[PDB]
Design a protein around this ligand. Structure first.
Ligand SMILES: Nc1nc2c(ncn2[C@H]2C[C@H](O)[C@@H](COP(=O)(O)OP(=O)(O)OP(=O)(O)O)O2)c(=O)[nH]1
Ligand SMILES: [Ca+2]
Ligand SMILES: [Ca+2]
Length: 579
DNA sequence: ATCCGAGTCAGG
DNA sequence: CCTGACTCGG
């Protein structure tokens, strides 16, 4: 047991201009949830306050909003939003222990202070699972244990602040935490709290048609299958297809036989049920995930949806979006995209405005690779897909049929991570002999992409890690693995990580430089979303002319590469219409 | 119950 | 290559 004042009230010696602060949201989704406890640690001691009391105090609430009071926490963003929900603001966070651990070694998957502490040999603090538990397991314990815990954390944060910073500084990532991640964290905070408005009525009439649509196919499947079965269980389905209907087994999952859309395109010719199955899956994924899914989570009063961008999960520096995931709304098949029509501004007479990097990930290859061909393609603003098709067929700026392009494109999608001939051949539905025969041609057509791939794999061998434009790391012990396929995975990570990685650094940065301008220019615009390479804003309809310059200007100039980045922008009265 | 793992597919 | 949500079913 470790002692601390167990406060009933706020003494001012809790308001020192530097403290580790802990603000416990024990709910798994932080949006509008109970704050269960608050521990503060400072030069004057270690204190515990109950939220009810604490949150009422104009003295405390004041200290919180003060950017001159420096706090140190773990996942300030969790506390930030939870507090924004209470109309309380949180400023002057100087060190976030979650973001730090995450830059040191994202693979450790640090989810709580206990994890962060292992890293630096500190152990007088307990995991979350130990105090709370797993599933229907997780519960809020009594104050005695709670106080003890929130303090032990806060204590650790105070303690680990400089051990952590010293390794970042040694690692060459001091300005990644300070200038990049922490600034962004605030920004995501606002974004998640702003929310995006959904048109629940249109979502309702989309679902309405899809059930009638779906009933229909369902029946047809059962008709031609000869019997009923749960189509969704592919274990049950394969039995219908490859046993009772006697069909060729072409691909195979590690368990039994495979029914991935890839195999079905191939089985189509073989029997009329095949395409009915594909239709059924597509229609059903809309309804399950983008109708019943979203509608399950609009906030009923405001009609908005509040995502959580997880700044500290991905192994390569992307963000992720959870519950719901606004980073995978349909856009590819035309009927899918209609969903986007349900994403509307939150103010009458405002517009969604959306801008994105053209080929960001490739452009980064070009810059990191220092291949001449690719650098020139981007500098002359050539349609990079069209130039690719040319180079792999050795043909003209018009002898490119549309199919030669669906092919060139797919290379550019995989050459960002050393795609396998086998792997490629899958997406393209071709013979593996042709897959590598396009690969072969790409490489002699862009042999600076070849070197890089050679080189990066060997730097990974030397250093045990790769890095990115802004010095994010990724360790890769499996690089020297005994085992062909494991060494191989690790070798594509070896080469792809600096690409995904910089691409993400660059946009995270664009977002900071953006908030920065909008705030100076007194503008009403604010970011709603990030989808890996686009930004989505809502602004007053009288503000587009500006954003059309501003947003591209700031995005393009976010960093400086041996290629010019390229941005596209569109705005409409909905997401669908900004395309 | 309740957890986890694969599967499939939506996006990058 | 990097995710996540929904789904069955060991
Ligand atoms: N990794 C991956 N990303 C894809 C794939 N297909 C589409 N994308 C995503 C990644 C890009 O950020 C985004 C670019 O949009 P498009 O697919 O329409 O390509 P783009 O507009 O650059 O070319 P286009 O103008 O359509 O000829 O799409 C794929 O097969 N793999
Ligand atoms: Ca395009
Ligand atoms: Ca895109």
């Amino acid at each position: 047991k470790m002692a601390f004042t167990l406060a009933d009230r706020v003494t001012e010696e809790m308001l020192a201009d530097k403290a580790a602060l802990v603000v416990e949201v024990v709910e798994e989704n932080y949006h509008d949830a109970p704050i269960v406890g608050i521990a503060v640690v400072n030069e004057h001691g270690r204190f515990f306050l109950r939220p009810e009391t604490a949150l009422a105090d104009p003295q405390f609430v004041a200290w919180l909003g003060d950017e001159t009071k420096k706090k140190s926490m773990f996942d300030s963003k969790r506390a930030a939003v939870a507090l924004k929900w209470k109309g309380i603001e949180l400023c002057g966070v100087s060190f976030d222990l979650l973001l730090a651990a995450y830059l040191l070694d994202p693979a450790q998957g640090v989810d709580d202070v206990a994890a962060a502490a292992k890293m630096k040999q500190y152990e007088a603090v307990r995991p979350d699972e130990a105090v709370y538990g797993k599933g229907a397991k997780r519960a809020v314990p009594d104050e005695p244990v709670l106080a003890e815990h929130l303090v032990r954390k806060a204590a650790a944060i105070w303690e680990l602040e400089r051990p952590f910073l010293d390794e970042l500084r040694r690692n060459e990532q001091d300005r990644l935490l300070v200038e990049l991640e922490q600034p962004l964290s605030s920004i995501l905070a606002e974004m998640e709290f702003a929310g995006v408005k959904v048109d629940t009525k249109r979502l309702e009439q989309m679902g309405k048609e899809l059930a009638e649509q779906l009933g229909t196919v369902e029946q047809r499947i059962y008709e031609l299958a000869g019997q009923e079965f749960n189509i969704n269980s592919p274990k049950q389905l394969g039995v219908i297809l490859f046993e009772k209907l006697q069909l060729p087994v072409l691909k195979k999952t590690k368990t039994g036989y495979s029914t991935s859309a890839d195999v079905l395109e191939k089985l189509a010719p073989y029997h009329e049920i095949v395409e009915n199955i594909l239709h059924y899956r597509q229609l059903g994924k809309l309804q399950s995930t983008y109708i019943e899914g979203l509608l399950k989570v609009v906030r009923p009063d405001t009609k908005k949806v509040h995502t959580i961008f997880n700044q500290a999960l991905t192994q390569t520096g992307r963000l992720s979006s959870t519950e719901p995931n606004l980073q995978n709304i349909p856009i590819r098949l035309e009927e899918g995209r209609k969903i986007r029509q349900a994403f509307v501004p939150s103010e009458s007479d405002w517009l969604i405005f959306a801008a994105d990097y053209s080929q960001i990930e490739l452009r980064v290859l070009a810059h990191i690779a220092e291949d001449d061909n690719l650098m020139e393609a981007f500098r002359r603003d050539l349609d990079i897909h069209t130039k690719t098709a040319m180079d792999i067929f050795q043909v003209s700026e018009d002898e490119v049929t549309p199919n030669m392009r669906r092919q060139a494109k797919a290379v550019n999608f995989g050459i960002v991570y050393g795609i396998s001939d086998y792997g490629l051949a899958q997406n393209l539905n071709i013979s593996r002999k042709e897959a590598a025969e396009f690969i072969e041609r790409y490489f002699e057509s862009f042999p600076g992409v070849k070197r890089y791939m050679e080189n990066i794999v060997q730097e990974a061998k030397q250093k045990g890690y790769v890095t990115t434009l802004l010095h994010r790391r990724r360790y890769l012990p499996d690089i020297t693995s005994r085992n062909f396929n494991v060494r191989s995975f690790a070798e594509r990570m070896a080469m792809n990580t600096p690409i995904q990685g910089s691409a993400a650094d660059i946009i995270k940065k664009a977002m900071i430089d953006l908030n920065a301008r909008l705030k100076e220019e007194r503008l009403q615009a604010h970011l709603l979303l990030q989808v890996h390479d686009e930004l989505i804003l809502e602004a007053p309809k009288e503000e587009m002319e500006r954003l059309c310059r501003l947003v591209p200007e700031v995005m393009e100039q976010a960093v400086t590469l041996r290629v010019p980045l390229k941005v596209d922008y569109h705005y409409g009265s909905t997401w669908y219409d900004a395309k």
